Design a protein around this ligand. Structure first.
Ligand code: D7K
Ligand code: D7K
Ligand code: D7K
Ligand code: D7K
Ligand code: CA
Ligand code: CA
Ligand code: CA
Lengths: 554, 554, 554
């Protein structure tokens, strides 16, 4: 009859539909651990709270659902701050559940207390709040979930004092609310949708650019219907890329990065329809190099701040991206009078091929394995049944060159934070979500980045998650070493070299399969072997450092 | 060719469509004052930054547009804090432009610097930011405006360093952006809209409740079309009241407080459609006294946190309230005949009438003028050409009982903050907005509350604003004195009596017309005379303290 | 046996030795009001929380003790923010006690809640904290007081939820702690004190500069002993000025401002001993105009950040200023071998006279009363039995010219915030403290500044505080109008004129004595008459606008 506050948390999460949590144990949060045991709710316990926080992100991004992180008081929270900051800029729906010092014995200099965790998370969350009463738990947890899941998606910090969690109350008096929040996002006014479709109809070279919000809602059947009716080529940033996987080949522009060479071929887009894609790092800021200044821009984003923040736009609609794609498909289903644009769809594909073929001709593995050749080996295994998680710096910049011609089930790369090392946790959580959908997860990381969470091979083995970790070992912090050589001088390299360590040996010591390769053939076999087994795998790949990816210079 | 940073602010403001500013001069913000002088943009300068901030709120609320407050470094900002907090909780679109210490001489213990103004405003603003470069001004001002105007509406702080404002750049080097933000808000998914209407048709006693976001968008014709087609009675909180003024009489429930006596009469609403109305103070929190626990609730709000915040709902839609109303009118114009609902509308009217009649029978002006009788005198002068601003606890609690039967052009009352004294500034700015709309502003306030900004009679006289200030003088901080008597004891009054001061004398000293009255006949005459003149006025009304308004008890 | 949380607050304040509180009533904080009634502890209730907050500052500054402000939830707190910011930069010990929304019904959109008051005050307090349990009240209130009173002095925000205050607990179980904090501040290491005294002994032109921390501890008998033994001239900023009142005339350098002309007469100080005085607005930043670059600087400040922040120093000691003055006196009491320096003490006095005599020759009241002549009239009445509070801009800049030759009991002027209008509240609280010591308080304010808190004449009358309010009426926001004329042009004056209002008429309407004067003779009589009566007084003084004070240009 009397239940704990931690029991109230879990019962509310269950009603919200959460099936997995990611965390690291603390006594402060044991009531949640105990309640999850009773309800058969798995908590994937990691070796670092950061890895657990990133895992919650990866699960959310790969699964297009809510991710739930569970950390303890003090160091538990502070270790989860990078994940929060990452999810903030990436717009990923994660409920960060954290313990804190009991409300009683406030200001007593006790263990794991004395830190204002809410204030620390306030600048990097949609909502950061501390629970003041055990009876408030169900409604506040549900409020937190509603905040995280709504447009634009983002992290929420819910702080649960040890006091509030251990407290026992009458279960018959406290109500557990349902998640009553519409799955269909708000759509544009018909007049705005008409104006958008009217501009798209008279455009000579229209282009659609998808952002992260297009991935969160994942209206794939609606997207295909709109694209098949209009015949407009679709581009996407890293986070929007997996949304292109269900589209016909002739309509796939790929990553927005290869819209760079369009100005030179006098093929700079006439109209650009930005759906969730923001003006920033991925879309070339307000330089006009990707999104042209001469082009008329229709931008749809749940945040009005983003509406033409770095560039003049022709139309700015505040609405949900999933709802807009749904609306665009619905309106165009009865239209049936759209221009051909087959020649324009051929031009965007040829220009993307022009880029890829140019890089291939300049790449050679005559002495050491070229990063681009290493990227191709992975690309050969990438389809709708595979989630690719990208970390490192040169590693991801090289990998992006092969990603726009394959159709991944998921592509989870760096966002605005660009924080090295987030990939391991991200991929771990992604694999948990991929197990549900019957997909395989592959992490492509740098030798520098992998060291951040290399202890997670233990978690892979303990939890039997068949994640394949590919380390692009160029014996250094690559892109930073490249900056030292190019921006300062060839003899000005310090603190960027990493000429030590057997990463596959580390993985083997944790119980995971460890491969080490230094050629195309050996890497091909190791990757094929890793895919064939239902085990955690590490593939340490010896890769050349000298080559400069086009995206580094740009 | 060379223009100041202040010029960039003003040129962006003009391109945004702002015609009035409210502020207090400072040397740090002089470049904005000088630029407004050149462009003939009037800055209504007050005697307190709080009044200027409140005036911008009142201008925003009465004119259903963007209010712009303009304050200086240090104390200029800190004096604007209450207006910011008030605009935050009330959801009013106000751009707060503030000066700050120069970026040069940072951390030099200089005049009006040394306080982190953004950090202070961050917990109570949609966005708070400090400009780092003069070149960034136009895009940042525009971004701030887009943030303020978008759902849910709210205040934005733009911190503009003296250094940044004084700096001069070539006018052709930085472009002034247009306000490219759709005036049409996002609307619900057709499926959600159809479920809402399906519930509305099936309901036996359906009710609509409007909130602040309905007033901000002001889709009056759409609301009228939707209401007439469905025949469903409409209620509103304080801020949504003026949106009932264009609606047919039989469909008017008045203020949401009227729902209280519906449970006793077995007439508790079967269904309630909440449009912008949040679960909180004005709707009876989660008590179920106004919004019944047994009712099926359709809630429409731009913020997902609010959806079923304190009470379980049947359907939670995240969308713009104005866009939703427009979508509801559009859908109900082209569907099947809706049920009559004539008898239910009559029941709503009669219960509101029975409350009004019950108070009138218990109100007696023998010995001293009764607050309800004083409220009736004002009520006989309220219509579409009148904006009523309410302050002062017991004052507005009594005044609310007469506001449902009348149809004001605007009704600006306390929100969640419930800060005494905000009314004067609010009414001052509302009068500026009413002047271009051809309306008259009347402030109804307490003797305690008026003292906060009593120096604004000077501003009324200097700027020739014909605001009528009605002071309900019960010679005390009334409601708080009642709290002491009811909750503690009869001999337990302390710090709540104000048995001093001729407020009509104060106004006269500032040059305003000053009336002192103590009866129905004398107050009627004074108010009639004040309405007949194009002059600012103060009517000091001696009123009884003992009467307890129904709304105080509940 | 069972007592409220508000009772615990008052019992703790009593044990701390507080005899007065300054506030404005709210139901949220009624338990404190009720407990003060029972214990005969006066709460000076004002007409604005800002005035109450400033009153707490003034009481603290004039009394050299702890000031206690008491404000309610929501608007109560936000109205008190300017006082907090002012006390923060001024380093004045004030305990800001604020109500807030009950911890139960957190996140319920209820009255006066939903604002994070702690986060808003965090950037401008030594400590901002919310009380989480009724049992914690006594220890946390005492902790707050210890924080405010210790070096450097500053404001503390203690947030007391309505919940926590109304809660009743067993009085026999909760202990009320004593204030156990040493009144003698920490002193420098003997080696540092020796090095300081050794530099002072060989110096040709040594000067002592006192800051606010010298006033807070007020070690007057120790200061005189050190000055009489060494014969070093003593300067002070506005806040340190009253500490010079017990010194011999030949040792009084006055305000640090007249150290400006020392470089021209080749009398730029050889050594400067800064005691609590910071590098900033009052000491001419790091320009070298007051504190020379060639001079060796010994700086003593409880904050290490301040130790040579804008200028190179020779010795930096982190210690309490009161403890240092005590230590300097103790060491020099047995020394008795100090150089004469009578000629240097004569030179500093002559240079101060040179300044005063130069201004007098340029001042004329032939057409309108000159601000300097008006300042002289006040100066004639200023001694150890008088506290002078200075507001306005030109008003205080002119008044500072006559202050360095009189010996005020107190001088409370603007600090770094420079916030216009703070003077009324400041003076009101100062008068309460002056009633204890048998002193009279005189506020010298501008016509612009007085409008901020002009309703406080009511409080003066209600509480029978004999404060004399002198308004220097130049029909405008003077210094800002001067900036428009000098920095932009003679025809570029907007929003700075105030050609309306009878301020004495306003004061008379509130029940206070109202004088209006426009000549030396009439002002002399009005001031003499105001001093003769034990009543609140307003002296509206017609004063010339055109004259430019030397401190404005500098
Ligand atoms: C009472 O609180 P407890 O939860 O029991 C814990 O916080 C603790 C217990 C006793 C002393 C100090 C800390 C402890 S003790 C503890 C186990 C440490 O395991 P380890 O194998 O390192 O040493 P040992 O105890 O087996 O000798 C954990 C995970 N926590 C929670 C925790 C999680 N993540 C981070 C970053 N810091 C933490 N303190
Ligand atoms: C331009 O800025 P850069 O400093 O060069 C850097 O931030 C970056 C990020 C994205 C693309 C290119 C460079 C990068 S790139 C980089 C090297 C990564 O080395 P890694 O071995 O993982 O991959 P690779 O580049 O050698 O293939 C570092 C250390 N940083 C700074 C950094 C430090 N610590 C953390 C948590 N995150 C970071 N991003
Ligand atoms: C329940 O809380 P209460 O303390 O009773 C109070 O906050 C209140 C009471 C009923 C409705 C709304 C607010 C009220 S009501 C109230 C008295 C208002 O006096 P006034 O003479 O203005 O009008 P009236 O009641 O006599 O008609 C005060 C001082 N307060 C606290 C307060 C103090 N300072 C500021 C800036 N805002 C505030 N709300
Ligand atoms: C150099 O900056 P300035 O803007 O000129 C100003 O801040 C100032 C402060 C100290 C000395 C000189 C000027 C001043 S001086 C000033 C005029 C004060 O007029 P007042 O009638 O009170 O006295 P006087 O100068 O005419 O004798 C104003 C409005 N401001 C800006 C301001 C606005 N609102 C608040 C709460 N505090 C402020 N300080
Ligand atoms: Ca690498
Ligand atoms: Ca009243
Ligand atoms: Ca003046």
């Amino acid at each position: 009859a009397m239940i704990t506050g931690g029991e109230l948390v879990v019962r509310t999460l269950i009603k919200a539909g959460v099936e997995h949590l990611f965390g690291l144990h603390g006594s402060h949060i044991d009531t949640i651990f105990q309640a999850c045991l009773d309800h058969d709710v798995p908590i994937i316990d990691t070796r670092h709270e950061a890895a657990a926080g990133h895992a919650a992100e990866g699960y959310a991004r790969a699964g297009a659902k809510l991710g739930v992180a569970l950390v303890t008081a003090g160091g538990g929270f502070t270790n989860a701050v990078t994940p929060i900051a990452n999810a903030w800029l990436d717009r990923t729906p994660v409920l960060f559940l954290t313990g804190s010092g009991a409300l009683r014995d406030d200001e007593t200099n006790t263990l794991q207390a004395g830190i204002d965790q809410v204030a620390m998370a306030a600048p990097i969350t949609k909502w950061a709040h501390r629970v003041m009463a055990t009876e408030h738990i169900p409604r506040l947890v549900m409020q937190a979930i509603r905040a995280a899941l709504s447009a634009p998606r983002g992290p929420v910090l819910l702080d649960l004092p040890w006091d509030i969690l251990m407290n026992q109350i009458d279960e018959d008096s406290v109500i557990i609310p349902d998640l009553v929040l519409s799955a269909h996002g708000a759509r544009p006014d018909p007049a705005d949708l008409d104006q958008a479709l009217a501009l798209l109809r008279k455009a000579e070279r229209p282009v659609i650019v998808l952002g992260s919000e297009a991935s969160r809602t994942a209206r794939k059947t609606a997207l295909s219907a709109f694209v098949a009716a209009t015949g407009v080529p679709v581009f996407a940033d890293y986070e929007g890329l997996s949304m292109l996987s269900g589209l016909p080949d002739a309509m796939r522009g790929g990553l927005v990065q290869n819209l760079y060479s369009f100005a030179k071929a006098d093929a700079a887009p006439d109209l650009v329809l930005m759906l969730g894609a923001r003006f920033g790092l991925n879309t070339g800021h307000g330089s006009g190099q990707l999104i042209p200044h001469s082009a008329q821009v229709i931008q749809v984003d749940p945040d009005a701040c983003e509406l033409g923040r770095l560039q003049g736009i022709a139309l700015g609609i505040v609405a949900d991206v999933g709802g807009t794609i749904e609306a665009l498909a619905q309106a165009t289903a009865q239209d049936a009078a759209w221009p051909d644009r087959g020649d324009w769809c051929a031009k965007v594909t040829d220009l993307a091929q022009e880029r890829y073929a140019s890089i291939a001709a300049k790449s050679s593995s005559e002495h050491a394995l070229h990063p681009f050749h290493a990227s191709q080996v992975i690309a050969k295994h990438v389809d709708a049944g595979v989630t690719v998680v990208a970390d490192g710096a040169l590693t991801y910049l090289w990998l992006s060159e092969v990603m726009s011609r394959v159709k991944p089930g998921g592509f989870l790369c760096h966002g605005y934070l660009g924080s090295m090392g987030v990939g391991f946790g991200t991929a771990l959580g992604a694999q948990v979500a991929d197990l549900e959908a019957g997909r395989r997860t592959i992490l492509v990381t740098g030798d520098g980045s992998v060291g951040y969470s290399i202890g997670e091979f233990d978690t892979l083995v303990r939890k039997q998650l068949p994640l394949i970790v590919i380390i692009m070992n160029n014996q250094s912090w690559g892109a930073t070493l490249h900056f030292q050589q190019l921006a300062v001088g060839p003899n000005r390299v310090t603190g960027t070299r990493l000429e030590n360590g057997s990463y596959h040996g580390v993985a083997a010591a944790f119980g995971a399969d460890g491969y080490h390769v230094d050629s195309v053939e050996s890497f091909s076999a190791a990757l094929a072997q890793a895919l064939a087994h239902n085990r955690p795998a590490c593939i340490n790949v010896a890769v050349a450092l000298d080559p400069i990816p086009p995206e580094e210079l740009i």
